[PDB]
């Protein structure tokens, strides 16, 4: 495969690693989720334009809108957590251990 595809898939892998390896902030993890979506968008767009799958041109639009809906949902969850604890720190989300 051409090397642009290599770098796009590499970007997805880096976003996945950044999301799986957490830090204190929730917003950083949500931004990693967004990067994963953006890399998926670009990979889909490259594949669809290159093979001239014309009806599949609309698929990146659908992916973008649905992932942005999920991002809105995650932002609302972060805001609720912050209103509970004053911060978006994931270490405060540990009271379900017991």
């Amino acid at each position: 495969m051409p090397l642009v595809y290599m770098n796009i898939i590499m970007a997805f892998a880096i976003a996945l690693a950044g999301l799986l390896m957490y830090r204190s902030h929730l917003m950083s993890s949500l931004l990693c989720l967004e990067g994963m979506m953006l890399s998926l968008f670009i990979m889909s767009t490259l594949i669809i334009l290159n093979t001239h799958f014309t009806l599949a041109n609309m698929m990146p639009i659908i992916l973008l809108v649905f992932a942005a809906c999920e991002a809105a949902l995650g932002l609302s969850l972060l805001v609720m957590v912050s209103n509970t604890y004053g911060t978006d720190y994931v270490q405060n989300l540990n009271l379900l251990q017991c």
Binding site: M36, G74, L93
Partner: protein
């Protein structure tokens, strides 16, 4: 929540699941998962306490990560085949990505950590929905792509699910966490036979959903979420605790009850494939689930724990609401073993 809004959100959850099960196109399957999650998040936060908020947040994080991995698997499959139809995956690493994503959505063992916490953090109705309806879509996708799964990966995850569900549930005094670990073990049982016979997976799923519905409805009827609170139920409604005991015995797979049917059929189908060590391991491991089921039965029906003085007040009162289909769910979860050959209807 508004009753109309809650009904709409429930319907949207079921419609996302149905979109997953009726689509031939991977994009629409992904859409169905997205819709299911979007509508599911508010029903988790229905009570709105910090436990509910944390349960919803952990659920959202795991499900969104799984959905992104699933989309990446779809995109790799399209990159190598140009195919959107849900069928065998044409790429092995895309298949691995998809299998891991579906297992994380299901909550199999290496991705099981969210199930106990989320189940504990939400209400019993939310947990009932979580542990019954949310298993349908990923399992249906798995049954559709079963001919291309790596049997080693799937069987590893299923065996780990059985082991961890057995061990994790041993330490629990919370009924919701016990339900979650039982669910992990039963998901492992479902996914072990998936490479060999998807009809066995459907059968086991139906039996498990019947038992889980019966048990969760008995818990809601009892208003008990801890083992000690359930230990008071005999002094209020002993019929509920005796029915719960027979249901727990069914969950343990004790003959001649309905819970023995999926294990027996799966062991038979596995031995048909020269699989003998794994079924023996699985049947032996399920004794842990049966052990903590028997602990619950001891504390609930087979013995009588101390009650409280304030329980005399509750004696003069009936239930405002009645659980729907609970008698049917109880009979189905205990008494259906003579009807086993009807499983061919699922073919």
């Amino acid at each position: 929540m508004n009753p109309i809004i809650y009904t709409t959100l429930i319907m949207t959850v079921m419609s996302g699941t149905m979109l997953v099960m009726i689509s031939s196109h991977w994009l629409l399957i992904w859409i169905g998962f997205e819709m299911n999650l979007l509508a599911m998040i508010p029903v988790l936060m229905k009570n709105f306490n910090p436990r509910a908020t944390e349960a919803a947040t952990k659920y959202f994080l795991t499900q969104a990560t799984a959905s992104m991995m699933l989309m990446m698997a779809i995109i790799i499959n399209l990159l190598y085949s140009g195919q959107w139809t849900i069928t065998k995956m044409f790429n092995p690493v895309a298949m691995t990505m998809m299998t891991m994503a579906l297992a994380m959505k299901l909550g199999l063992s290496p991705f099981h950590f969210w199930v106990p916490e989320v189940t504990q953090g939400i209400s019993l109705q939310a947990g009932l929905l979580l542990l019954t309806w949310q298993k349908l879509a990923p399992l249906s996708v798995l049954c559709q792509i079963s001919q291309s799964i790596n049997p080693n990966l799937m069987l590893t995850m299923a065996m780990l699910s059985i082991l961890i569900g057995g061990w994790g549930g041993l330490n629990q005094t919370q009924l919701r966490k016990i339900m979650a670990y039982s669910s992990i073990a039963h998901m492992g049982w479902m996914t072990a036979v998936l490479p060999y016979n998807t009809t066995m997976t459907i059968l086991n799923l139906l039996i498990y959903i019947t038992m889980t519905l019966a048990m969760f409805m008995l818990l809601i009827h009892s208003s008990a979420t801890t083992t000690l609170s359930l230990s008071h139920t005999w002094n209020k409604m002993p019929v509920i605790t005796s029915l719960m005991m027979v249901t727990l015995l069914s969950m343990g797979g004790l003959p001649p009850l309905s819970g023995f049917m999926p294990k027996w059929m799966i062991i038979q189908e596995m031995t048909k494939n020269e699989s003998i060590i794994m079924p023996t391991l699985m049947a032996m491991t399920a004794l842990l689930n049966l052990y903590f089921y028997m602990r619950l039965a001891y504390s609930s029906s087979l013995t009588m724990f101390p009650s409280t003085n304030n329980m005399k007040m509750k004696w003069q009162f009936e239930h405002t609401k009645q659980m729907k289909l609970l008698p049917t769910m109880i009979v189905l979860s205990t008494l259906v073993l003579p009807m086993t050959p009807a499983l061919s209807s699922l073919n």
